C-alpha cells in the first residue's frame, strides 16, 4: 500500500459576486484516495456548492456558483485519504463585489461562442481576456479543468490569445466549455459555450479553378462591354473584380462561382483582373480591354 | 348608487361591479373604493386617467378587456397594492412604461395580449418581479424585450409571446425560472434559438418563425419533440421545409472566408488618420474582431471604431507600439485570420 | 404538385387549394395558375410578394386571413382580373396604397378588418369602385378616410368601420349609395354626425362608442326615433357620461360666438397681422372680408390661421374697413377693424 | 271663370355639370291652373328630374340635379292650363363642365352652415359669392324659391346698411333645407345645402354682465405673492379675464366663466390690474390696487 500524495492542490482564489469559483484537487495512492471538501471544519453542503469528480477518480472539483459574498468568503480544505493515510490542504476564498472590483481586474473582452465540429476534425474555441497585469487563461469543460499541460496532445492551448485548439475531435469532446482569466488580482469566468460533435461527412476538397476565364475584348471608344468570369471547386469560389491593385466591385456581396463585369464609357485601354477565392486557394485572371480608333 | 346600465353587488366581502357592453366612454367616477372585483369589458374607454383607480386599496381583480384604451396615465395603478390580476387585453396600448405599473406589489397575473405594444420599458415590471406568476404579451408589436427583467421573475410559470416580431431571445435568461412550465414563441422573427434550458414539465413552442437552419439549430433538431409545424426559411435548399422532417446531416454551417482584406501591409509614419477594412462571409455570418499589437482586443472605445461591415477606424496613432494588426473572423464552423503589418 | 398538409384538388375546371394551419412561412411557390379558389388562413405568412400571385387570372377567391402579413408588394394583386373576394383580415397591414389594389377589376368583397391600417391612399379603390358590394375596415388605426372614393362606390351595400380613430365623416358622401343597407361607425372619435341621408331597403346606422359632443348640432338626431344603441355623451361637462337618448331635447344647447380678442381698431405700409379669436359652443369659425370683396386666406398674398389670425406684403393703397366674421351654429359675431 | 295668366316665368340658365338647375313658373286663374313641364314636347320623366309645387298652388318648380351634360341641354317649357285656358312659355337650359368654366363664373366662397334657432327669434344664414361681373344672390328653401323681394317682411336679404338671409321671428314653417344661388350673365351656381332647425322658445332673462364680487385692493411686501378674486354674473354668463392695462394676462384657452382668480408672484413693483367681464350684452371693467408696502 501507499499513503496519499497531492498531485494538484487548490490555490487562493478571488472571484466576483454572482460569478464562479472552482477548487481543483487531485491525489494518488494505493488504494485510491477519496477526496472530501470542508468549509470551517464541516463537509460542504449547499445548493450552490457542487462537487465534480474526475474521470480518473484521481480527485474532484469543488464548484461554487453563483458566488455570494460574504456567505462563501471563508476557508475551504481538501482532505485526501485512503486505508493507510489521511492528508489535507486548505485554501482561502475571497469574493469581491462590483463596487470593489479594482482597475486591472480580469475582464473578458471576448468569450467562447457556439461551435460545431465534425469528428476527426479540428475545433477552436476563442477567448480574449484583459487586465493588469496580463492574466493567464485556463479552460473548463463540463465543470472540469481541460488538461493542456501536455504540449503535444490533441488538445493544446495557443501561446502568444490563449485559445483552445481541439484536434481530431471525438464524441467525448462534445460538452460545455468556459474560459477562465486569472491574475494576481483575481479570477473571472466567461460565459459558457457548447461544442457539438457531428459525424464525419466525407466531402471532396478542390482548390478554385476557372472553368470559364475572362476573354480579351476589343471595343469602340466609349464604349461598353460585359465580361464573364466563372470559377469552380469545392468549396465554391467567391468571384470578384479588380483594376490592378484596387477592388472594382466594392460593397457588393461576392457572388458564388460567377461574376459578370459591366464596363461603360471606355475611353482608355486597360487590364481588368478577375479573382476567385476559397479557403483552399486564390487564383487570378486578367482581361485585356483595348480602345481602337 | 350604481352607475346606469351597470350591475353592482355590494354584499360583503366581495363587492363586485360589472359593466359589460354599456357603451362607457370613461371609467365611471365616484365608484365605491371598497371594491374587490372590477370588470369593465366590452366598452369604449379611450384612456385611463390617474383619477380612475385612485384610492382602491381593496381591489384585487381588475379587468379592462376589449375597449379602445390607447393611453394609460402615469401612476394610474399607484395605489392598487392589493391587486393580484390585471387584464388590459384587446386594447390600443402602444408601450409599457415603469411609471404606469408602479405600486403593483401583489400583481401575480398580468395580461396585455392583443395590443399594439411596440416597446416594453426595461425594468417596468419592478413593482412585481418577485410575485408575478403569469405574463401575457401575445399579439403585439414587440421586436425586442427586456430579458434581464424576465430573468428575475422567479415565480413565473407561464410566459406567452404568441404573435410578435421578436428577433432573438437572450441566452442568459430562464436560468432561475424553475417554475416555468410554458413559453410561447410562436409567430415571431426568430432566426435561431439559444442552447438554453429549453430541454427539461415544460412546453416551448417556436413554430411560425423564419428559422435559419444551420448548425446553430443542430442541438434542437437532436431533441425528441412532437412536430409543431416548425418550418425553415433559410437557406434556399431548405426553404419551406418542415424542421423535424430534415435529417440532422443537412444542417450545415460554412466556415468564414475573409474576402476583402487590407492586403497584408500598411504604413503611416505620423499622427495622420488611418483606416483598415475586413469583411468576412460564411454561414452564419462571421463576427469580425480586431487585435492590437499588444494582443489587446479593440472595441468601441476612444479613438477606435468598428463597424457592422468590419472596418477598423483609428484616428490618432501613437506609433510607439507598431506591430501586426490581425483581423479575426469568428464563426460557428471555424475561424479566419487576415493579419496586417503596420509601423 | 401539392404541398404537405394541404388539400388541393386539381380536377378541372374548378381547381381548389386549401392550406389552413400548415405553418406556412411564405405563399407556396408553383401554384397552378388555373386555380379558382385559394385559401391560406391561419398560417404565418410575413409578406406578400408580387410573384406570389403572378398570373392567377382564374382566381376568384383569395383568403389570407389570420397571418402576420406586414407588407404587400406593389402590383401584388395585378392580373387578378377574375378575383371577386379578397380576405386580408387579422394581419399587420399599416396602409392601403393604390399600387397594391391594382387590377382587381371584378372585386366585390374586400375585407381588411383587424389590421393596423393608419392611412388609406385616396383613390386606392379605383380598380373596383363600381363593383364593390362589401368593404370592411373594422379594427384599424384609421383617423381619416378617402370619403371621396367611398362616395363613388354605387353597388356598395355594407360598409363597416367598427373600431377606428376616425375623427370626422364627410357630409356629401352616401348620396349615390342607394344600395347601402349597413353602416357601422361604432367606437371612433366622432364628436358629431352630419345631417345626411341617415334617416330613410331598410338601413342600420350604428354610431355608438363615440365621444359625442351634445349640442345643437346633434339636435336633429335626437329628434329621430331610433332604438337605444347605448350611445353616450362625452362633452360638455353637464352631460358627460350621460346616455344620448335619455337626454331631453331642450338640454342640447349651443352658445353664440363672442369675439374676445379684437385688434382694437389698430401700419408700416410696406409689410403685413390681425388677430381674431371667438369663443362659443361649438367653436366658431373665423372669416375675413375685403372692403368691397370677400377676403380669401391660405393663399398667395393672404394667409389665415386656425386661430383666426390674418397674415404678406401690404399694398400702398388698399386700406379700408376690414371686418372679422365669427360664424357659429347658434349665431354670428362681428368685430370690424380699420387699419392703414 | 278666368283663363290662366303668368305671374312669373322661368329664365335661361347656364349651370355646371353635377350641379343644380331650378325653373320657377307661376300662374293664376279661375280655377287654379295646373302646371306641366315638358322637354322636347314630352312631359318630363326622369330620376334626376323632380317637380316641386308651391304650397299655395300658384305654380311649381322643375328641379334638375345633378346636372348631366348634354342629356339635359335642351329647351324646357311651362304649360299652365285649366278648363277654360291653356298657355305656355319656354326657356333653354345650358350645362357646362369644369373645363368650360370661364373666369368670372359664380363661385361660392362661403356657403350656408347648420343653424338652430329658438321660436320667435332671429336666424341668419350666410353666403359669399364671387365672380365677374358681381352675381346676384337668391335663396332656396326645400327646393322652392324664398321670396325676399319684399324688403319689409320678417324674411329679408341684406345688401346695403354679403347677401345673407335674415330670418326674423322664427316659426316652425322656417325649419327646412336652405341653399344659396349665385347668378350672373355668365351662368348659375348653387351652394351646398344647409339645414335650419326651429326649437321651442326657452324663456330666459337677458341681463348684461355685472360684477357680483369685484376685485379688492391688496397690499403686499416685495416678492411677494397674492391672489385676486374677480366674480361676474349675468345671462349669458360673462367671460372673465385679466389684463395689466393693455396686455392680456389670461389665455383664451384657459378663459373661465363667471369666476377668475389671478395669481401673482415675485411682486417687486406696485401696479394696477384690470379685470374684464365679457358677454354678448356688454363689456365691463374693474381695477384692483396692488401696492408694495414694507
Ligand atoms: C495587359 O497585359 C498584357 C500582358 O499580360 C500586356 O501586353 C504585353 O505588354 C508587354 C510590355 O508592357 C509587352 O512586352 C508584351 O509584348 C505584351 N504582350 C501582349 C500579348 O500584348 C499589356 O500591355 C497590358 N495592358 C495594359 C493596359 O496594362
Ligand atoms: C460599434 O459602434 C458602431 C456605431 O458607432 C456600431 O455600428 C452600428 O451597429 C449596428 C449593428 O450592430 C448596425 O446596424 C448599424 O448600421 C451600425 N451603425 C454605424 C454608424 O456603424 C457597431 O455595431 C458597434 N460595434 C461593436 C463591435 O460594438
Ligand atoms: C392654412 O390652413 C391650415 C388649416 O387647414 C393651417 O394649418 C394649421 O396650422 C396651425 C398652427 O399654425 C395648427 O394649429 C393647425 O392644426 C393647422 N390645421 C390643421 C387642420 O392641421 C395653415 O396654417 C394655414 N396656412 C397658413 C399660412 O396659416
Ligand atoms: C450587359 O448586361 C446587362 C444586363 O442588364 C445588359 O442590360 C446589357 O445590354 C449588356 N451589355 C452588353 C454590351 O452586352
Ligand atoms: C384613501 O382612503 C382612506 C380611507 O379609505 C381615506 O382616509 C383617505 O383620505 C383616502 N385618500 C385620499 C387622498 O383621499
Ligand atoms: C393662491 O392660490 C394658490 C392655488 O393653489 C394657492 O396655492 C396659494 O396658497 C394661494 N395663495 C394665497 C395667499 O392664498
Ligand atoms: C392706479 O389707479 C389710480 C387711480 O384710480 C391711480 O391714482 C394710480 O396712479 C394707479 N396706480 C398705478 C401703479 O398706476
Author numbering:
A (entry chain A): 28 to 187, 196 to 328
B (entry chain B): 33 to 232, 244 to 386
C (entry chain D): 33 to 232, 243 to 308, 311 to 316, 318 to 356, 358 to 386
D (entry chain C): 28 to 188, 196 to 328
Sentences from the paper on this structure:
Type-IIa receptor protein tyrosine phosphatases (RPTPs) and neurexins are the two major presynaptic organizers. In mammals, the type-IIa RPTPs have three members, PTPδ, PTPσ, and LAR. These members possess a large extracellular domain (ECD) consisting of three immunoglobulin-like (Ig) domains and four to eight fibronectin type-III (Fn) domains, followed by a single transmembrane helix and a cytoplasmic domain harboring two protein tyrosine phosphatase (PTP) domains: the first PTP domain is active, while the second domain is inactive. SALM family proteins have five isoforms (SALM1–SALM5). Their ECDs share the same domain organization consisting of a leucine-rich repeat (LRR) domain, an Ig domain and an Fn domain with 35% amino-acid sequence identity. We determined the crystal structures of apo-SALM5 (LRR–Ig), and PTPδ (Ig1–Ig3)–SALM2 (LRR–Ig) and PTPδ (Ig1–Fn1)–SALM5 (LRR–Ig) complexes at 3.08, 3.16, and 4.18 Å resolutions, respectively.
In both the PTPδ–SALM2 and PTPδ–SALM5 crystals, there are two complexes in the asymmetric unit. The binding modes of the PTPδ and SALM ECDs are quite similar between the PTPδ–SALM2 and PTPδ–SALM5 complexes: the Ig2 and Ig3 domains of PTPδ sandwiches the Ig domain of SALM2 or SALM5. The Ig2 domain of PTPδ also interacts with the LRR domain of SALM2 or SALM5. Although Pro362 of SALM5 is replaced by Ala375 in SALM2, a similar hydrogen bond is formed between the main chains of PTPδ Val143 and SALM2 Ala375 in the PTPδ–SALM2 complex. No electron density of the meA9 insert (188ESIGGTPIR196) in PTPδ Ig2 was observed in either the PTPδ–SALM2 or PTPδ–SALM5 complex, suggesting that meA is completely disordered and not involved in the binding of PTPδ to SALM2 or SALM5. The LRR domains of SALM2 and SALM5 in the asymmetric units of the crystals are aligned in an antiparallel fashion with their long sides facing each other. We therefore tested the possibility of homodimer formation of SALM2 and SALM5 LRR–Ig molecules in solution by size-exclusion chromatography coupled with multi-angle laser light scattering (SEC-MALS). The theoretical molar masses of the monomeric SALM2 and SALM5 LRR–Ig-His6 molecules are 40.2 and 41.2 kDa, whereas the molar masses of the SALM2 and SALM5 LRR–Ig-His6 molecules determined by SEC-MALS are 77.0 and 77.1 kDa, respectively, indicating that both SALM2 and SALM5 form homodimers in solution. However, we found no marked structural difference in either the PTPδ-binding or dimerization interface between the presynapse-inducing SALM5 and the non-presynapse-inducing SALM2. On the other hand, the positions of the bound PTPδ and SALM Ig relative to the SALM LRR dimers slightly differ between the PTPδ–SALM2 and PTPδ–SALM5 complexes, as shown in the superposition of these two complexes.
